[PDB]
């Protein structure tokens, strides 16, 4: 049925809005991953942006059209250093998953939007594994983790495919050249 | 010194024409991987042009000028399916990780480019790594294990960044309703 007039469609429009506003700030704090050093973060940023973009098409899809007015508040600002941004990134995925996205998704339910409640529950599915990823990341920079770790693994380098093993990431690539910011713990997820 | 006259700058040039090459061609195979719905795998295709790139541009920054002529053999062709594709990948890959550039630094270090053999040592690594990513992925479609596994496990919308829990990923991503093609097993690399 329609959405017209529900409270459903207002929470998807203040959805959408929060979701492009995480979009911007998320693209922004990628290019200070980037200044500080963090090459894998700095492209997880990105990602995460580009997800956000896509969890708003999807939101953006549903509507009828008009304007709508809407009401919400908003993080003013700001940017800081990269574990800052991390933990601030991971505190509005964690309101997302936990009360925005599963309340919207109840009164989905309550006012006969089955398929939108469904998902708005799955964003928030989404929505969890990005704080995980910018939790994660917060605490390697805490610890002293990001480049160096207790035993002997394998680092590759984003820039080039460079390979090395030790217990951590060389100073510059010697394949490439690049700073030690490039490198990661190898990953195979296949 | 100078790379002016010896092997080790014809191997030099040789080496950036092949890389150049290999580039272009993972594009064109990331792009068919795409058509034939597979993204992770257009995506690795796509990154692996990326870092070919660079492989080149380190070897490009070490010549002195001029033109030089070449003697060299190419893969005239083709564009297949992606499983073709993956297989063809790992061969140029194969040869130039255990023949090419074993063999240019060899040269190099016999005529005292130390920091030349070096890198093209490193690049090596590199391609090898290169090798078990198309081989993996090639498996992986010749045993329809892609989007499949015996076990249930954790599958992630490259799209969105939902996951999804179970033996294989879902038809339709529930968040963004994109197609399977979009899914790849989650992974943690941090
Ligand atoms: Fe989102
Ligand atoms: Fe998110
Ligand atoms: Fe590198
Ligand atoms: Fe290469
Ligand atoms: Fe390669
Ligand atoms: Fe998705």
């Given amino acids: 049925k329609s ?4 409270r459903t469609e207002k929470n998807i429009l203040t959805a959408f809005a929060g979701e492009s506003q995480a979009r911007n700030r998320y693209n922004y704090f990628g290019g200070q991953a980037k200044k500080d050093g963090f090459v894998q973060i700095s492209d997880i940023f990105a990602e995460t ?3 956000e973009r896509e969890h708003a098409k999807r939101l953006f899809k549903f509507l009828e059209g008009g304007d709508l007015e809407i009401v919400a508040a908003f993080p003013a600002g700001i940017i800081a250093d ?3 941004n991390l933990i601030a990134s991971a505190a509005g995925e ?3 998953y936990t009360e925005m996205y599963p309340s919207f998704a109840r009164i989905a339910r309550e006012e006969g939007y089955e398929e939108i409640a469904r998902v708005f529950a ?4 989404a929505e969890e594994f990005h704080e995980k990823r910018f939790l994660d ?3 390697n920079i805490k610890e002293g983790r990001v480049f160096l770790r207790e035993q002997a693994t394998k680092w590759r380098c984003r820039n080039c ?4 093993e030790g217990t ?3 100073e510059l690539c010697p394949a490439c050249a690049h700073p030690k910011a490039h490198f990661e713990l190898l990953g195979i997820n296949w």
């Avoid at 799955?122 to 599915?125: E, K, W, Y």
Wanted: glycine residues 12%; without cysteine; aromatic residues 8%.
């Fill in 82 to 84: 990269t574990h800052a």
């Fill in 168 to 170: 951590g990431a060389p």
């Fill in 49 to 51: 942006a580009d997800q």
């Fill in 94 to 96: 964690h309101h997302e």
């Fill in 122 to 125: 799955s964003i928030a599915v």
């Fill in 3 to 6: 959405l017209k007039g529900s």
């Fill in 137 to 139: 990341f917060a605490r």
């Fill in 161 to 164: 495919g460079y390979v090395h």
